[PDB]
Amino acid sequence: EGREDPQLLVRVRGGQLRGIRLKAPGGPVSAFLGIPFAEPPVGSRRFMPPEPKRPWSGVLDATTFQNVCYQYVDTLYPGFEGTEMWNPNRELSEDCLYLNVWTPYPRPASPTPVLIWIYGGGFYSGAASLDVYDGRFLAQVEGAVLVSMNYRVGTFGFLALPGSREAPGNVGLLDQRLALQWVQENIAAFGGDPMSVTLFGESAGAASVGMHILSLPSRSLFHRAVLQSGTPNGPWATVSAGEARRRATLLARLVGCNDTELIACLRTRPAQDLVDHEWHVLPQESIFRFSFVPVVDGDFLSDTPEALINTGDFQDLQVLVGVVKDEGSYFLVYGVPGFSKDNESLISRAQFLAGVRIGVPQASDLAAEAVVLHYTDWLHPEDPTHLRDAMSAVVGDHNVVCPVAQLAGRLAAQGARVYAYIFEHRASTLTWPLWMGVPHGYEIEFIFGLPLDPSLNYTTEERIFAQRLMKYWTNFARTGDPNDPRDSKSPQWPPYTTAAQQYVSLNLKPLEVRRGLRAQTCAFWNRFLPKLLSA
Amino acid sequence: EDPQLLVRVRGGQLRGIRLKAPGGPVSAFLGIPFAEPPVGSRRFMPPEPKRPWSGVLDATTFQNVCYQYVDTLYPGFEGTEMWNPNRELSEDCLYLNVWTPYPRPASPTPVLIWIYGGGFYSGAASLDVYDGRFLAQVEGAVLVSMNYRVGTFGFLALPGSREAPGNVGLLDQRLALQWVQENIAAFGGDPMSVTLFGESAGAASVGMHILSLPSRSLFHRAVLQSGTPNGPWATVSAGEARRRATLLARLVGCNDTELIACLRTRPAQDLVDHEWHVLPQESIFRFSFVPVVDGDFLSDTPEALINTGDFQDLQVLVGVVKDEGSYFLVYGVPGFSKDNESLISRAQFLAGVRIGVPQASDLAAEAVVLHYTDWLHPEDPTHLRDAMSAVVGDHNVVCPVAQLAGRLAAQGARVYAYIFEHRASTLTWPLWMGVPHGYEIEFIFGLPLDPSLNYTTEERIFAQRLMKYWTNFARTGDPNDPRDSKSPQWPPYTTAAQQYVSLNLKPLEVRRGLRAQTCAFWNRFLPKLLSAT
Ligand SMILES: *[C@@H]1O[C@H](CO[C@@H]2O[C@@H](C)[C@@H](O)[C@@H](O)[C@@H]2O)[C@@H](O)[C@H](O)[C@H]1NC(C)=O
Ligand SMILES: NC(=O)c1cc[n+](COC[n+]2ccccc2/C=N/O)cc1
Ligand SMILES: NC(=O)c1cc[n+](COC[n+]2ccccc2/C=N/O)cc1
Ligand SMILES: *[C@@H]1O[C@H](CO)[C@@H](O)[C@H](O)[C@H]1NC(C)=O
Ligand SMILES: *[C@@H]1O[C@H](CO)[C@@H](O)[C@H](O)[C@H]1NC(C)=O
Known part of the structure; x- marks a missing residue:
């Protein structure tokens, strides 16, 4: 120490860190990347809850992203930007429990509202290090303190033998919770306010947020939550104990392995062997279904998300929830015959029914x-055009739109302040075909402010749009209200209520208020389909 | 003695009456016996042809109304009373009426045969709304209407028995159709151009004649207004007919011969008094004694027969009114009344x-x-009220109509479809009821052309348009004016395009899909849900 940038040296509970000054378009930001928040969950620690990181000596270099949690890598369209943007951009390792902090440079003078990002990827994939999760624009433009953590995915994060000591399930969620605990203890060192923490996530990340809402030990660790295209309730985000047990014990057989013996044997298996077989345990040919996800354990989740949202008291909570225009389309090209990114995917009636x-x-x-x-x-x-688009809607409505409608309704009925959106702008830079619309995940780059980077080739309107979205999101983090307190001229975003069911359109035009989130069709999925299942 | 009013038919001579239509005179021959009175041992039995008569039979007056339940819900209210019998009740009621131009047509004229509705338990060809003079005067039509037995008298069945075979009210209709074939040329009618039209239960009857082979040689085209042979109310199975007749016999104090013989001893009103007590559930748009799938008149269910029939040489005009269900709501569903806005709760909606x-x-x-x-x-509450109406209308009329239209079109029939959306200015029902079941008839029959009835001038012009569609249909199987070169045209209903027209005060508008989404629920999904359960 002595010749370095004094404004990049910070101490946390585990020791000293050296961060990096990053260039954002409007000026510098501070980044502290690859901060360990847990003991490496490796060897005998595989499948186990994370243990807090033991202190290190010296100055830990926090200038680069750390390892990505061991995971399946989608190889459907090799070298295609639309798929590669989600793939790991650092070495895959089980030693992966690290988090990232971006702050203004120099660090904020007074306690600053914190945003914690939880990535999606089906609970089998994702990294906090991906370019679309780059916290530098929020840090620079909105003065935000941004935190993102890696958490274990796939078998490593979610394989459960429920009731066992050695694989109790949900440990990827405990990884997230430990990062939230880390923020509580340490974020003040960066100028962050631990008394104002907003979780936000997309897809599996948003399901994860909703699960922290529904799990008491997590509720002391944040104040507001944003759920983007994902929910703890719905058909994909959890599995029963019995189904988790079944899947784990099948995965075990598929790799050559009393839960203690079974688990001990799984721990002797190469990480890649588990990844190579994880997808093989799904009970049916599926899309928007994932092998190893949170389990209703009677612990992290004391009851099903459905039951917990229906009977919960959500008085002291503000939530921002929403969907994109085309939730389902992304998933069609990965499993439904007749669907492709490389053609118009006009399908036959027979292909509709199979889909x-x-x-x-x-x-x-x-x-x-x-x-x-x-x-x-x-x-x-x-x-064929209608059938194609209806196949998309089926998948989007079932897995996202109607679970979101259900969540917003239950939460608002039970005292939460809820704000709802539909995101309807298709990035001019999008590599997927037009028919796919505004696919799952393609709002994230705008919320994070990437269009602000002149080197990315977004339009001027997309730059301004991204700035709007950054304001809504940071305004919400700051106040639990996405509206500008100053700006009475702009159209207002009303809370979502069960009576009026209002939500706003997020697109290049000013905020437009709409009513009912697929109200008629979501009654089918949310009220009727359940009754038809049990018959 | 006016020679225009003297007609010889196979049974003998008839004397009709010169009636006045606003355009000029018409010849009416009313109260013509087409069958032996179905009285005594003939009760519940198929009709027999009327024996010849001596001298000149007086056909200047409507005959008696077939014995039936008279409605008492709103006594002296024109909206319910207009359907009530307007002549004396009698089992001796098998008579028919013929209107013709005056003087009678110079050349063979297309015949329209009206079959009334009334849920198979009521109705008469003598009601003012079925008055054939306007169509005869203005359109030059030969119009025929018959009485047919209703209620237990027309439809009580002990399927398999000789003496209560079921379907005799339909056999009555058929006999009148045979009468027209044998006799209509004497009035100037063309027996080679006969069009059946009917509404509600009368439209279901028309559909049954389409589905029963012996009837098919007796007509060439059909119009079904707000009713179908298929659907939840128009027919019962043989088992359900047997059970309903057995219950009724039990209720009045009565081996089939023995049971039927005892039922024939009962005064007519004793049967009517217990008619309504045999329904399996509390219901609306459900009727006690209706056509029975006997394996004879109906060789299979209307559903089976429409699915599998060959309808190549048939033309059909089918349609519905805007608010098929509203009428039925005041007759069984709590919270519903003509005397208020009928704004209901959610609980009243589920119960309804x-x-x-x-x-x-x-x-x-x-x-x-x-x-x-x-x-x-x-x-x-306004939404729940309108939805309740729609449930009833869709279930009972709109979706059955759409189903029929589609099967007929797919199987070779030329089909035209309509929705009727004009509410008479003279309607006595409240506004929330909209355009109720039955309230298109007065327009088709041309009653607005009568200045004394107080319809608006636009309604007279509209009634004239409708009379033209119906008679053009009768003449040609196409409701379009053959020398009207701007319109637009009324296209045939097909399964591909599903085109139908709105009948209101504005020019025809073509629409596609007659409640397509909702009727898929009723026609495709419900059958699978009930069966599976
Ligand atoms: C659209 O594409 C689907 C899969 O494509 C395979 O990839 C495409 C790009 C084709 O060009 C061909 O090489 C392969 O079939 C097909 O399943 C689907 O049928 C395609 N649609 C049609 C009819 O071309
Ligand atoms: N291990 C797994 O559960 C799994 C499940 C599904 N996929 C399919 O990859 C397509 N995909 C790609 C990106 C995001 C989600 C999806 C899921 N569609 O069902 C891979 C692994
Ligand atoms: N005998 C019967 O089945 C019966 C059924 C219904 N009603 C009541 O009249 C109401 N109504 C009046 C005209 C046309 C049909 C209806 C049927 N509604 O359920 C009387 C007798
Ligand atoms: C943006 O445009 C430039 C100039 O044409 C091009 O060379 C570059 O590859 C583009 N970058 C992206 C990320 O699209
Ligand atoms: C109107 O009258 C009906 C029947 O008498 C009654 O049930 C109700 O009080 C009124 N309708 C509603 C539900 O407003």
Whole structure:
């Protein structure tokens, strides 16, 4: 120490850190990347809850992202930007429990509201180090303190033998919770306010946020939450104990392995062997379904997300929730025959009915026919364009839009302040075909402020749009209200209520208020389909 | 003695009456016996042809109304009373009426045969709304209407028995159709151009004649207004008919011969008094004694026969009014009245659904409620009221119509479809009821052309348009004016395009898909849900 930048040296509970001055378009930011928040969950620690990081000696270099948690790498369209943007950008390792902090430079003078990002990727993938999660624009433009953590995914994070000591399940969620605890203890060192912490995440990340809302030990660790295209309730975000046990014990067989013996044997297996087999344990040909996800354990989750949202008191909570225009389309090209990024994906009626079975894999025959009946345009029942778009809607509505509608409704009925959005702008830079619309995940780059980087080739309107979104999000973090307190001229974003069911459109035009989030179709999924299942 | 009013038919001579239509005179021959009075041992039996008569039979007056239940819900209210018998009740009621131009047509004229509705338990060809003079004067039509037995008298069945075979009210209709074939040329009618039209239960009757081979040689084209042979109310199975007749016989104090013989001893009103007590559930748009799938008149269910029939040489005009269900709500569903806005609660909506869809399981009724609830306005009483009407209308009329139209079109029939959306300015029902079941008839028959009735001038012009569609249809099987070169045209209904027209005060508008999404629920999904359960 002595010749370095004095404004980049910070101490946390575990010791000294040296960060890096990053260039954001408007000026410098401080980044502290690859901060360990847990003991490496390796060897005998695999499948186990994380233990806090033991203090280090000396100055830990925090200038580069750390390892990505061991994971499956999607190889469907090799070298295609649309798929590669989500793939690991650092070495895959089980030694991966590290977090990242961005702050203004120099660090804020007074306690600053903190945003904690939890990435998505089906609970089998993702990294806090991806370019779309770059906290420098929020830090620089909004003065935000931004934190993102890595958490264990796939088997390493979610393989459970429920009731066991050695693989109790949900440890990827405990990884996240430990980062939240780390922020509570340490964020003040960076100028962050531990008394104002907002969780935000997308897809599996948003399910994860919602699970922290529903899990008491987490509720002391944050104040507001944003759920983007994901929910703890719904068909994909959790599995019963029995189903987790079944999947884990099948995975075990598939790799050559009393839970103690089974688990001991799984711990002797190469990380890649587990990854190579994880996808093989799904009970049906599916899309938008993932092998190793949070388990209703009677611990982290004391009951099903459905039951917990229905009976919970959510008085002291503000939540921002929303969806993109086309939640389902991304998933079609990965498992539904007739669908491709490289053509118009105009499908036949036969391909529609096969796709409903894949998209709603838990459905009986009658339930599947109810879905088909509902989603068919009976004026044009064989029209390939309508069938393609209805297949998309089926998947989007079932997995995202209607779970989101359900969550916003239950939360608002029970005292939470809720704000709802539909994100409808398709990035001019998008590499997916037009038919896919505004796919799952393609709002993130705007919320994080990437269009502000002149080297990325977004339009001027997209720059301004991104700035708007950054304001909503940081205004919400700051106050639990995304509206500008100053700006009475701009259109206002009303809270979502059960009575009026209001939400706003997020696109290049000013905020437009709409009513009912697929109210008619979501009654099908949320009220009728359950009753039809049990019959 | 006016020679225009003297006609010889196979049974003998008839004397009709010169009636006045606003345009000029018409010849009416009313109260012509087409059958032996179905009295005594003939009760419940098929009709027999009327024996020849001596001298000149007086046909200047409507005959008696077939014995039936008279409605008492709103006594002396024109909206209910206009359907009530307007001549004396009698089992001796098998008579028919013929209007013709005056002087009678110079050349063979297309015949329209009206079959009234009234749920198979009521109705008469003598009601003012079925008055054939306007069509005869203005359109030059030969119009025929018959009485046919209704209620237990027309439809009580002990299927398999010789003496209560079921379907005799339909056999009455058929006999009148045979009468027209044998006799109509004497009035100037063309027996080679006969068009059946009817409404509600009369439209279902028309559809049954389409589905029964012996009837098919007796007509060439058909119009079904607000009713179909298929659907939840128009027919019962043989088992359910047997059970209903056995219950009724039990109720009045009565081996089939023995049971039927005892029923024939009972005064007519004793049967009517217990008619309504044999329904399996509390319901609306459900009727006690209706056509029975006997394996004879109906060789299979209307559903089976429409699915598998060959309808190549047939033209059909089918349609519905804007608010098929509203009428039925005041007759069984709590919270509904003509005397207020009938704004209902959610609880009253679920209860109404069990009554409106009486055959529904808990789960099926829940599907109905969930489909018809506006989830933006779940508890809005105006929405719940209109949805209740729609449930009844769709279930009983709109969706059966769409189903029939589609099967007929797919199987070779030339089909035209309409929705009728003009509410008479003279209607005595409240506004919330909209355009109720039955309230297009007065327009088709041309009553607005009568200045004394106080319809608006626009309604007279509209009634004239409709009379033209119906008679053009009768003449040609195409309702379009053959020398009207701007319109636009009324296209045939097909399964691909599903085109139908709106009939209102504005020019024809073509629409596609007659409640397509909702009727898929009723026509495709419900059958699978009830059966599976
Ligand atoms: C659209 O693409 C699907 C899969 O593509 C395979 O990839 C595409 C790009 C084709 O060009 C061909 O090489 C392969 O079939 C097909 O399943 C689907 O049928 C395609 N749509 C049509 C009819 O071209
Ligand atoms: N291990 C797994 O559960 C798994 C499940 C699904 N996929 C499929 O990859 C397609 N995909 C790619 C990106 C995001 C989600 C999805 C899921 N679609 O069902 C890979 C691994
Ligand atoms: N005998 C019967 O089945 C019966 C059924 C219904 N009503 C009540 O009249 C109401 N109504 C009046 C005109 C046309 C049909 C209806 C049927 N509503 O359920 C009387 C007798
Ligand atoms: C942006 O545009 C420039 C200039 O045409 C091009 O060379 C560069 O590759 C583009 N970058 C991206 C990320 O699209
Ligand atoms: C109107 O009258 C009906 C029947 O008498 C009654 O149930 C109700 O009080 C009124 N309708 C509603 C539900 O407003």
